[PDB]
Structure formats: structure tokens, C-alpha cells
Amino acid sequence: RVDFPRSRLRFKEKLGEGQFGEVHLCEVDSPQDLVSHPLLVAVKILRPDATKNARNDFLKEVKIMSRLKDPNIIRLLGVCVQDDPLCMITDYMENGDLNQFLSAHQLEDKAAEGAPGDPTISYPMLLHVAAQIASGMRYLATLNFVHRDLATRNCLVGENFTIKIADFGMSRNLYAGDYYRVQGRAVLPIRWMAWECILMGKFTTASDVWAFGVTLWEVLMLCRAQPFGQLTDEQVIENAGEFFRDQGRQVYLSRPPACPQGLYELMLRCWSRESEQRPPFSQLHRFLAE
Numbered sequence: 001r002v003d004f005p006r007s008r009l010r011f012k013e014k015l016g017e018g019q020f021g022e023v024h025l026c027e028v029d030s031p032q033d034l035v036s037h038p039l040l041v042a043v044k045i046l047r048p049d050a051t052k053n054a055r056n057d058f059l060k061e062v063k064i065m066s067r068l069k070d071p072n073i074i075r076l077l078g079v080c081v082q083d084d085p086l087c088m089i090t091d092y093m094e095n096g097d098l099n100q101f102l103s104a105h106q107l108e109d110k111a112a113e114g115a116p117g118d119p120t121i122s123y124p125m126l127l128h129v130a131a132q133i134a135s136g137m138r139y140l141a142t143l144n145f146v147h148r149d150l151a152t153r154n155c156l157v158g159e160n161f162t163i164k165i166a167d168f169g170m171s172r173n174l175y176a177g178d179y180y181r182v183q184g185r186a187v188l189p190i191r192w193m194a195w196e197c198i199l200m201g202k203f204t205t206a207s208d209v210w211a212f213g214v215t216l217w218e219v220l221m222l223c224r225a226q227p228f229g230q231l232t233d234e235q236v237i238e239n240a241g242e243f244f245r246d247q248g249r250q251v252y253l254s255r256p257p258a259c260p261q262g263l264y265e266l267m268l269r270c271w272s273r274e275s276e277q278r279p280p281f282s283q284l285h286r287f288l289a290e
């Protein structure tokens with residue numbers, strides 16, 4: 001297995017920067033360097049002073065991505081692992097992450113004539129978006145692959161509302177509020193987590209389905225609110241306990257203004273107390289893509 005030629009990566013702009021690296025947008029001329037006119041790629045590079053643990057994390061991140069080959073999953077274009085600055089190369093998704101994208105749009109209304117504010121997105125397009133997410137998750141489930149951090153902040157939008165699922169980890173300061181963190185413990189996206197995940201700390205496909213229910217809720221909110229937004233983290237964790245008790249005191253996310261009751265009731269099924277009663281992704285995908 002040979003390296004992608006880093007000299008073929010022409011820098012365009014720093015796209016982002018993190019604790020152990022930077023992310024660059026680069027152009028690749030004549031991209032017959034890959035088995036799968038300039039190509040736009042995103043590049044993740046480990047900062048030179050990267051500690052030994054960070055480097056190991058990088059190499060493992062790269063191994064994990066090599067598995068993923070699906071239209072609605074992010075794909076690893078190539079890597080630079082043999083020499084000093086370590087790189088991961090992937091497709092540039094020109095419309096950024098799904099959370100920021102939806103935050104910039106308003107809901108379409110064909111019964112009205114109004115002054116042009118933000119760009120619109122129709123209810124059918126929101127479903128097209130959700131369906132693709134379900135298709136990606138469906139593929140991961142056939143790999144018995146567990147995501148563990150599904151949310152709009154981890155989806156990417158390309159041309160023509162094509163969506164891919166990804167995982168940026170949990171260190172980007174923009175979304176630091178979507179994660180609960182206690183010294184000595186693992187970092188947790190509790191507002192997206194199923195109750196048994198919060199209490200017992202183990203993740204499964206059944207729990208991915210829960211998080212998908214929350215991500216769908218985000219999409220239909222046009223990402224205007226954080227889930228359980230008026231609740232503190234302690235309260236959100238307590239609520240998981242209330243699911244465990246099962247005495248009718250657990251609370252759910254409310255129906256979004258856009259959202260038809262039927263679509264909502266689908267979100268409810270994703271939040272069943274019992275794992276095995278939550279719909280499979282295949283069944284989700286079939287509902288949304290109809």
C-alpha cells in the first residue's frame with residue numbers, strides 16, 4: 001500500500017484548525033491517482049509537535065475510514081502516512097456541515113408571497129436529506145459498524161443536497177456544548193444519546209437509531225435549537241433515569257413547527273424504551289424515501 005503523493009496537493013485555503021492539526025482545502029490536478037477539472041479535496045494534517053498518543057489516534061482513525069465505501073458515507077481518498085506530516089485526504093464537500101447549512105435557510109412557503117430573506121428549503125427536500133442519512137446508517141448497520149455520535153454537526157453537504165455521514169470527533173470548539181464532560185470520564189453527546197447509553201455507557205445500533213431520531217428532529221427544526229435546550233445537562237441525564245424507571249415521567253422532544261404528526265410519530269418510535277422495538281434503518285429509509 002503506497003502513499004498519496006503530497007506534492008500533488010496544491011493548497012487553496014485553511015479550512016479549519018484543531019488541537020492536534022489543521023484542515024486544508026487543496027486542489028488535485030488530473031486525479032487518476034485514485035482507483036475510485038481540478039479535484040477539490042479536504043486534507044487533515046497532524047501538527048508537527050503531535051504527541052505519540054495523537055499520532056496513534058490518527059493512524060487508527062485512518063484504518064477505520066478505509067472500511068467505509070458508500071455513497072452517503074464519507075470516503076477516504078488517500079493518505080500520507082510514511083513521512084513527517086501525517087495526512088488524511090477526502091472529498092471537499094462544498095456546502096459544509098449540515099448544521100451550519102440548515103441554520104442558513106428558512107422553510108419554504110408556496111402559499112405566500114414575501115420579501116426574500118434567507119434561501120429556502122422545501123419539506124420534500126428535508127425528507128430527501130433525512131433519507132440519505134438513513135441510507136448511510138443502513139449501510140453502516142450491514143457492516144455491524146456503530147457510529148456513536150450521529151448528529152447534524154457530523155453530516156456533510158455536497159452539490160445538490162447530497163449528504164454524507166462523517167465523524168469529526170468531539171474537540172471542535174464550535175460544538176463543545178453538545179458534549180458533556182467530567183474529569184476521568186469519557187466525553188458524551190448526551191442530548192443525542194439513548195437512555196441506556198447514558199446510564200450504562202455502551203453503544204449499539206439500537207442506540208444509533210435513537211440518535212437518528214434526534215438528528216431528524218434537528219433537520220425539521222432547521223437546526224434552530226439544541227435538543228432539550230431548556231434543560232440542563234443534569235436534567236437530561238435525570239431524564240434517562242426516568243426512562244429506566246418507566247413510571248410515566250420521561251419526557252420527549254416536542255413536535256417541530258414544520259413537522260407533520262406522522263413524521264413525528266416516526267421519531268417517537270426511534271425513542272422507544274426497549275431497544276428492539278425501535279425501527280431498523282431499512283424501515284426508516286423506506287418510510288422517508290417514499
Ligand SMILES: Nc1ncc(Oc2cccc(CCNC(=O)c3cccc(OC(F)(F)F)c3)c2)cn1
Pocket residue numbers: 015023042043044061064065068073074090091092093094095096097140147156165166167168
Ligand atoms: N467542507 C468539508 N468537506 C469535507 C471535510 O472532511 C473532513 C475534513 C477533516 C476531517 C474529517 C474527519 C474525517 N474522519 C471521519 O469522518 C471519520 C472518522 C472515524 C470514523 C468515521 O465513521 C464514519 F464515517 F462512519 F462516520 C468517520 C473530515 C470537511 N469539511
